[PDB]
PDB file of C-alpha atoms and ligand atoms in Angstrom:
ATOM      1  CA  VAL J   1       4.199  16.237  -8.337  1.00  0.00           C
ATOM      2  CA  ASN J   2       1.883  14.701  -5.724  1.00  0.00           C
ATOM      3  CA  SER J   3      -1.119  16.031  -7.639  1.00  0.00           C
ATOM      4  CA  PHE J   4      -3.957  13.934  -6.240  1.00  0.00           C
ATOM      5  CA  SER J   5      -7.472  14.646  -7.453  1.00  0.00           C
ATOM      6  CA  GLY J   6     -10.809  12.878  -7.315  1.00  0.00           C
ATOM      7  CA  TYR J   7     -10.203  11.372  -3.876  1.00  0.00           C
ATOM      8  CA  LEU J   8     -12.879  11.290  -1.217  1.00  0.00           C
ATOM      9  CA  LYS J   9     -11.775  12.811   2.093  1.00  0.00           C
ATOM     10  CA  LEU J  10     -12.319  10.380   4.982  1.00  0.00           C
ATOM     11  CA  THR J  11     -10.432  12.227   7.744  1.00  0.00           C
ATOM     12  CA  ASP J  12      -8.044  15.164   8.042  1.00  0.00           C
ATOM     13  CA  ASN J  13      -5.230  13.025   6.554  1.00  0.00           C
ATOM     14  CA  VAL J  14      -6.781   9.924   4.884  1.00  0.00           C
ATOM     15  CA  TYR J  15      -8.300   9.920   1.384  1.00  0.00           C
ATOM     16  CA  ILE J  16      -9.698   7.152  -0.864  1.00  0.00           C
ATOM     17  CA  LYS J  17     -10.397   6.652  -4.590  1.00  0.00           C
ATOM     18  CA  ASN J  18     -11.785   3.793  -6.688  1.00  0.00           C
ATOM     19  CA  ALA J  19      -8.863   3.283  -9.060  1.00  0.00           C
ATOM     20  CA  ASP J  20      -5.900   1.147 -10.135  1.00  0.00           C
ATOM     21  CA  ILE J  21      -2.847   2.182  -8.122  1.00  0.00           C
ATOM     22  CA  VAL J  22      -0.651   1.936 -11.264  1.00  0.00           C
ATOM     23  CA  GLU J  23      -2.818   4.347 -13.230  1.00  0.00           C
ATOM     24  CA  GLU J  24      -2.903   6.700 -10.235  1.00  0.00           C
ATOM     25  CA  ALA J  25       0.900   6.623  -9.995  1.00  0.00           C
ATOM     26  CA  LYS J  26       1.280   7.643 -13.632  1.00  0.00           C
ATOM     27  CA  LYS J  27      -1.126  10.577 -13.123  1.00  0.00           C
ATOM     28  CA  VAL J  28      -0.151  11.903  -9.679  1.00  0.00           C
ATOM     29  CA  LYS J  29       3.673  11.602  -9.890  1.00  0.00           C
ATOM     30  CA  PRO J  30       4.005  10.666  -6.228  1.00  0.00           C
ATOM     31  CA  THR J  31       7.144  10.929  -4.201  1.00  0.00           C
ATOM     32  CA  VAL J  32       6.198   7.570  -2.615  1.00  0.00           C
ATOM     33  CA  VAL J  33       4.082   4.643  -3.788  1.00  0.00           C
ATOM     34  CA  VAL J  34       3.459   1.853  -1.259  1.00  0.00           C
ATOM     35  CA  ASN J  35       3.572  -1.832  -2.187  1.00  0.00           C
ATOM     36  CA  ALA J  36       1.598  -4.483  -0.188  1.00  0.00           C
ATOM     37  CA  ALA J  37       4.521  -6.919   0.009  1.00  0.00           C
ATOM     38  CA  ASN J  38       5.502 -10.283   1.444  1.00  0.00           C
ATOM     39  CA  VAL J  39       8.650 -10.786   3.520  1.00  0.00           C
ATOM     40  CA  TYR J  40      10.521 -12.074   0.420  1.00  0.00           C
ATOM     41  CA  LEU J  41       9.605  -9.200  -1.934  1.00  0.00           C
ATOM     42  CA  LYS J  42       8.384 -11.863  -4.390  1.00  0.00           C
ATOM     43  CA  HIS J  43       5.786  -9.808  -6.227  1.00  0.00           C
ATOM     44  CA  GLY J  44       2.575 -11.823  -6.685  1.00  0.00           C
ATOM     45  CA  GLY J  45      -0.911 -11.413  -8.048  1.00  0.00           C
ATOM     46  CA  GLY J  46      -2.183  -8.260  -6.353  1.00  0.00           C
ATOM     47  CA  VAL J  47      -0.843  -4.730  -6.130  1.00  0.00           C
ATOM     48  CA  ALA J  48       2.750  -6.019  -6.090  1.00  0.00           C
ATOM     49  CA  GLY J  49       2.374  -7.780  -9.448  1.00  0.00           C
ATOM     50  CA  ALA J  50       0.694  -4.737 -10.970  1.00  0.00           C
ATOM     51  CA  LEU J  51       3.408  -2.340  -9.835  1.00  0.00           C
ATOM     52  CA  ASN J  52       6.145  -4.733 -10.963  1.00  0.00           C
ATOM     53  CA  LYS J  53       4.620  -5.303 -14.409  1.00  0.00           C
ATOM     54  CA  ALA J  54       4.482  -1.523 -14.905  1.00  0.00           C
ATOM     55  CA  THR J  55       8.270  -1.356 -14.309  1.00  0.00           C
ATOM     56  CA  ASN J  56       8.847  -4.152 -16.853  1.00  0.00           C
ATOM     57  CA  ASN J  57      10.153  -6.343 -14.019  1.00  0.00           C
ATOM     58  CA  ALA J  58      12.798  -3.841 -12.842  1.00  0.00           C
ATOM     59  CA  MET J  59      11.142  -3.771  -9.416  1.00  0.00           C
ATOM     60  CA  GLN J  60      11.510  -7.553  -9.047  1.00  0.00           C
ATOM     61  CA  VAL J  61      15.188  -7.517 -10.094  1.00  0.00           C
ATOM     62  CA  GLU J  62      15.984  -4.770  -7.593  1.00  0.00           C
ATOM     63  CA  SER J  63      14.006  -6.679  -4.949  1.00  0.00           C
ATOM     64  CA  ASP J  64      15.994  -9.840  -5.682  1.00  0.00           C
ATOM     65  CA  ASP J  65      19.238  -7.943  -5.027  1.00  0.00           C
ATOM     66  CA  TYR J  66      17.875  -6.424  -1.787  1.00  0.00           C
ATOM     67  CA  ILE J  67      16.777  -9.807  -0.457  1.00  0.00           C
ATOM     68  CA  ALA J  68      20.012 -11.546  -1.413  1.00  0.00           C
ATOM     69  CA  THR J  69      21.994  -8.846   0.399  1.00  0.00           C
ATOM     70  CA  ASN J  70      19.803  -8.392   3.502  1.00  0.00           C
ATOM     71  CA  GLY J  71      17.622 -11.499   3.843  1.00  0.00           C
ATOM     72  CA  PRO J  72      13.834 -11.454   4.371  1.00  0.00           C
ATOM     73  CA  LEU J  73      11.929  -8.603   5.978  1.00  0.00           C
ATOM     74  CA  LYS J  74       9.942  -9.070   9.178  1.00  0.00           C
ATOM     75  CA  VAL J  75       6.141  -9.070   9.181  1.00  0.00           C
ATOM     76  CA  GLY J  76       5.095  -5.471   9.931  1.00  0.00           C
ATOM     77  CA  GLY J  77       8.397  -4.118   8.582  1.00  0.00           C
ATOM     78  CA  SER J  78       9.349  -2.233   5.444  1.00  0.00           C
ATOM     79  CA  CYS J  79      12.145  -1.085   3.174  1.00  0.00           C
ATOM     80  CA  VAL J  80      12.544   1.769   0.680  1.00  0.00           C
ATOM     81  CA  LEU J  81      13.626   0.932  -2.877  1.00  0.00           C
ATOM     82  CA  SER J  82      13.407   2.782  -6.183  1.00  0.00           C
ATOM     83  CA  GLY J  83      10.060   3.872  -7.552  1.00  0.00           C
ATOM     84  CA  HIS J  84      11.376   3.392 -11.122  1.00  0.00           C
ATOM     85  CA  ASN J  85       8.968   4.999 -13.651  1.00  0.00           C
ATOM     86  CA  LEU J  86       6.043   5.174 -11.151  1.00  0.00           C
ATOM     87  CA  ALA J  87       7.404   7.265  -8.242  1.00  0.00           C
ATOM     88  CA  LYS J  88      10.628   8.549  -6.716  1.00  0.00           C
ATOM     89  CA  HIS J  89      10.508   5.756  -4.103  1.00  0.00           C
ATOM     90  CA  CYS J  90       8.575   2.552  -3.483  1.00  0.00           C
ATOM     91  CA  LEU J  91       7.925   1.783   0.193  1.00  0.00           C
ATOM     92  CA  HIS J  92       7.484  -2.005   0.410  1.00  0.00           C
ATOM     93  CA  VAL J  93       5.432  -2.797   3.538  1.00  0.00           C
ATOM     94  CA  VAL J  94       4.592  -6.263   4.876  1.00  0.00           C
ATOM     95  CA  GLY J  95       1.097  -6.624   6.344  1.00  0.00           C
ATOM     96  CA  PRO J  96       0.222  -9.848   8.208  1.00  0.00           C
ATOM     97  CA  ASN J  97      -0.954 -12.826   6.163  1.00  0.00           C
ATOM     98  CA  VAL J  98      -4.129 -13.638   8.092  1.00  0.00           C
ATOM     99  CA  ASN J  99      -4.867 -16.522   5.710  1.00  0.00           C
ATOM    100  CA  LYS J 100      -1.668 -18.140   7.097  1.00  0.00           C
ATOM    101  CA  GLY J 101      -2.455 -17.305  10.751  1.00  0.00           C
ATOM    102  CA  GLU J 102      -0.171 -14.284  11.251  1.00  0.00           C
ATOM    103  CA  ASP J 103      -1.174 -11.916  14.062  1.00  0.00           C
ATOM    104  CA  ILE J 104      -3.643  -9.209  13.011  1.00  0.00           C
ATOM    105  CA  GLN J 105      -2.040  -6.820  15.526  1.00  0.00           C
ATOM    106  CA  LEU J 106       0.946  -6.557  13.123  1.00  0.00           C
ATOM    107  CA  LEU J 107      -1.262  -4.464  10.809  1.00  0.00           C
ATOM    108  CA  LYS J 108      -0.708  -1.518  13.174  1.00  0.00           C
ATOM    109  CA  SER J 109       3.069  -1.976  12.928  1.00  0.00           C
ATOM    110  CA  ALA J 110       2.725  -2.184   9.136  1.00  0.00           C
ATOM    111  CA  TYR J 111       0.877   1.138   8.895  1.00  0.00           C
ATOM    112  CA  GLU J 112       3.381   2.813  11.272  1.00  0.00           C
ATOM    113  CA  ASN J 113       5.885   2.604   8.385  1.00  0.00           C
ATOM    114  CA  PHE J 114       3.773   5.154   6.505  1.00  0.00           C
ATOM    115  CA  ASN J 115       4.475   7.805   9.202  1.00  0.00           C
ATOM    116  CA  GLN J 116       8.069   8.288   7.963  1.00  0.00           C
ATOM    117  CA  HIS J 117       6.821   9.906   4.694  1.00  0.00           C
ATOM    118  CA  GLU J 118       4.906  13.172   4.394  1.00  0.00           C
ATOM    119  CA  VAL J 119       2.602  12.024   1.543  1.00  0.00           C
ATOM    120  CA  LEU J 120       1.932   8.508   0.109  1.00  0.00           C
ATOM    121  CA  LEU J 121      -0.096   6.772  -2.637  1.00  0.00           C
ATOM    122  CA  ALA J 122      -0.970   3.428  -1.084  1.00  0.00           C
ATOM    123  CA  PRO J 123      -3.173   0.303  -1.192  1.00  0.00           C
ATOM    124  CA  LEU J 124      -5.200  -1.186   1.668  1.00  0.00           C
ATOM    125  CA  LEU J 125      -2.675  -3.535   3.358  1.00  0.00           C
ATOM    126  CA  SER J 126      -3.524  -7.226   3.908  1.00  0.00           C
ATOM    127  CA  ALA J 127      -7.053  -6.857   2.436  1.00  0.00           C
ATOM    128  CA  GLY J 128      -6.537  -9.043  -0.675  1.00  0.00           C
ATOM    129  CA  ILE J 129      -4.336 -12.129  -0.948  1.00  0.00           C
ATOM    130  CA  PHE J 130      -3.524 -11.854   2.788  1.00  0.00           C
ATOM    131  CA  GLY J 131      -7.218 -12.122   3.751  1.00  0.00           C
ATOM    132  CA  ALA J 132      -7.637  -9.522   6.524  1.00  0.00           C
ATOM    133  CA  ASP J 133     -10.957  -7.807   7.164  1.00  0.00           C
ATOM    134  CA  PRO J 134     -10.763  -4.696   4.927  1.00  0.00           C
ATOM    135  CA  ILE J 135     -12.924  -2.599   7.289  1.00  0.00           C
ATOM    136  CA  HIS J 136     -10.316  -3.321   9.986  1.00  0.00           C
ATOM    137  CA  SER J 137      -7.405  -2.470   7.674  1.00  0.00           C
ATOM    138  CA  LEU J 138      -8.972   0.890   6.807  1.00  0.00           C
ATOM    139  CA  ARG J 139      -9.761   1.770  10.430  1.00  0.00           C
ATOM    140  CA  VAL J 140      -6.231   0.796  11.604  1.00  0.00           C
ATOM    141  CA  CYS J 141      -4.860   3.043   8.835  1.00  0.00           C
ATOM    142  CA  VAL J 142      -7.070   5.935   9.986  1.00  0.00           C
ATOM    143  CA  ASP J 143      -6.095   5.424  13.669  1.00  0.00           C
ATOM    144  CA  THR J 144      -2.330   4.903  13.070  1.00  0.00           C
ATOM    145  CA  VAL J 145      -1.153   7.009  10.131  1.00  0.00           C
ATOM    146  CA  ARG J 146      -0.581  10.721  10.884  1.00  0.00           C
ATOM    147  CA  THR J 147       0.880  11.743   7.500  1.00  0.00           C
ATOM    148  CA  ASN J 148      -1.181  12.189   4.315  1.00  0.00           C
ATOM    149  CA  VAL J 149      -2.272   8.904   2.724  1.00  0.00           C
ATOM    150  CA  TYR J 150      -4.185   8.580  -0.571  1.00  0.00           C
ATOM    151  CA  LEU J 151      -5.645   5.063  -0.860  1.00  0.00           C
ATOM    152  CA  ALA J 152      -6.297   3.506  -4.291  1.00  0.00           C
ATOM    153  CA  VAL J 153      -8.888   0.700  -4.052  1.00  0.00           C
ATOM    154  CA  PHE J 154      -9.376  -0.950  -7.443  1.00  0.00           C
ATOM    155  CA  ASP J 155     -12.229  -3.223  -6.346  1.00  0.00           C
ATOM    156  CA  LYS J 156     -15.370  -1.127  -6.787  1.00  0.00           C
ATOM    157  CA  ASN J 157     -17.512  -3.470  -4.681  1.00  0.00           C
ATOM    158  CA  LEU J 158     -15.074  -3.034  -1.799  1.00  0.00           C
ATOM    159  CA  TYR J 159     -14.689   0.730  -2.293  1.00  0.00           C
ATOM    160  CA  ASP J 160     -18.455   1.217  -2.064  1.00  0.00           C
ATOM    161  CA  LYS J 161     -18.631  -0.986   1.060  1.00  0.00           C
ATOM    162  CA  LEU J 162     -15.788   0.863   2.851  1.00  0.00           C
ATOM    163  CA  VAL J 163     -17.212   4.288   2.047  1.00  0.00           C
ATOM    164  CA  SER J 164     -20.792   3.359   3.067  1.00  0.00           C
ATOM    165  CA  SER J 165     -19.745   2.058   6.496  1.00  0.00           C
ATOM    166  CA  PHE J 166     -17.147   4.767   7.093  1.00  0.00           C
ATOM    167  CA  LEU J 167     -19.280   7.833   6.319  1.00  0.00           C
TER     168      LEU J 167
HETATM  169  N1  LIG D   1      -8.908  -3.066  -4.291  1.00  0.00           N
HETATM  170  C1  LIG D   1      -7.922  -3.598  -4.086  1.00  0.00           C
HETATM  171  C2  LIG D   1      -6.679  -4.386  -3.962  1.00  0.00           C
HETATM  172  C3  LIG D   1      -6.002  -4.377  -5.308  1.00  0.00           C
HETATM  173  C4  LIG D   1      -5.583  -5.466  -6.112  1.00  0.00           C
HETATM  174  C5  LIG D   1      -4.994  -4.923  -7.257  1.00  0.00           C
HETATM  175  C6  LIG D   1      -5.049  -3.547  -7.151  1.00  0.00           C
HETATM  176  C7  LIG D   1      -4.640  -2.463  -7.970  1.00  0.00           C
HETATM  177  N2  LIG D   1      -4.034  -2.655  -9.148  1.00  0.00           N
HETATM  178  N3  LIG D   1      -4.840  -1.192  -7.534  1.00  0.00           N
HETATM  179  C8  LIG D   1      -5.463  -0.995  -6.352  1.00  0.00           C
HETATM  180  N4  LIG D   1      -5.883  -1.935  -5.548  1.00  0.00           N
HETATM  181  N5  LIG D   1      -5.669  -3.233  -5.966  1.00  0.00           N
HETATM  182  O1  LIG D   1      -5.762  -3.873  -3.000  1.00  0.00           O
HETATM  183  C9  LIG D   1      -5.877  -4.556  -1.704  1.00  0.00           C
HETATM  184  C10 LIG D   1      -4.556  -5.238  -1.378  1.00  0.00           C
HETATM  185  O2  LIG D   1      -4.538  -6.584  -1.909  1.00  0.00           O
HETATM  186  P1  LIG D   1      -3.151  -7.337  -2.236  1.00  0.00           P
HETATM  187  O3  LIG D   1      -3.570  -8.725  -2.531  1.00  0.00           O
HETATM  188  O4  LIG D   1      -2.370  -6.591  -3.279  1.00  0.00           O
HETATM  189  O5  LIG D   1      -2.307  -7.232  -0.883  1.00  0.00           O
HETATM  190  P2  LIG D   1      -2.209  -8.109   0.498  1.00  0.00           P
HETATM  191  O6  LIG D   1      -1.433  -7.334   1.499  1.00  0.00           O
HETATM  192  O7  LIG D   1      -3.577  -8.591   0.817  1.00  0.00           O
HETATM  193  O8  LIG D   1      -1.424  -9.409  -0.011  1.00  0.00           O
HETATM  194  C11 LIG D   1       0.013  -9.319  -0.211  1.00  0.00           C
HETATM  195  C12 LIG D   1       0.458 -10.453  -1.103  1.00  0.00           C
HETATM  196  O9  LIG D   1      -0.112 -10.296  -2.425  1.00  0.00           O
HETATM  197  C13 LIG D   1       0.926 -10.289  -3.421  1.00  0.00           C
HETATM  198  O10 LIG D   1       0.592  -9.388  -4.433  1.00  0.00           O
HETATM  199  C14 LIG D   1       2.184  -9.919  -2.652  1.00  0.00           C
HETATM  200  O11 LIG D   1       3.388 -10.301  -3.319  1.00  0.00           O
HETATM  201  C15 LIG D   1       1.969 -10.589  -1.296  1.00  0.00           C
HETATM  202  O12 LIG D   1       2.364 -11.960  -1.287  1.00  0.00           O
HETATM  203  C16 LIG D   1      -7.081  -5.481  -1.862  1.00  0.00           C
HETATM  204  O13 LIG D   1      -8.304  -4.825  -1.535  1.00  0.00           O
HETATM  205  C17 LIG D   1      -6.998  -5.773  -3.362  1.00  0.00           C
HETATM  206  O14 LIG D   1      -8.182  -6.338  -3.910  1.00  0.00           O
END
C-alpha cells in the first residue's frame, strides 16, 4: 500500500513522475487518488475520463448518484467517493476553469482539499482542459499542500518543462 517509486523529489512533501495516473494507481495501491473534476462530476477527456474508464464506468454512476442527491460542487471544493479498483478513496477536486474565466485564486482553495489526507496520488489541477498555467499550478501545490503528494504527469513535454524550471 502507498508504495510509490520512481518519483523525483521536488520538496520535503511534493514528488513528481512522468506517468499515467491510472497505471500508477494500479501499481502503488494508494489510499487516495485525486480526480481533476468539474462541479458536475461529469467525467470528461482528461484524468477524469481515464480514471472512470478504468472503473468500467462505476465512478460515473456513483458520481451521478452523488450529484442527484447533493447538487453541484463549488469551484475549489471537493468530495470523497469510492476509489473502486484503483484506490480506497477518490478525492474529486474542482480546480478553476481558466478557459471559462474562473478566478485563478481558487486553485489555492482546490489544493487545500489535499491537506485532509496524509498521502495522495494526484494530477496537476486545472493544467489541461481547464487551461491554467501549469507552472503556476505546480507552485501553488508546493506552497499550499503540507501532506505528501505524488504527482503523475502523463505529458512528457510538460513534465520536462516543469522539472527544468523547478530545479
Ligand atoms: N499530464 C497531464 C494531464 C493528464 C491528462 C491525462 C492524464 C493521465 N492519464 N495521467 C496523468 N496526467 N494526465 O493532467 C493535467 C490535468 O488535466 P485535466 O484536463 O485532466 O484536468 P483540468 O483540471 O485541467 O480539467 C478538468 C476537466 O477535464 C475533464 O477531464 C474533467 O471532467 C473536467 O471537466 C494536465 O497536465 C493533463 O495534460
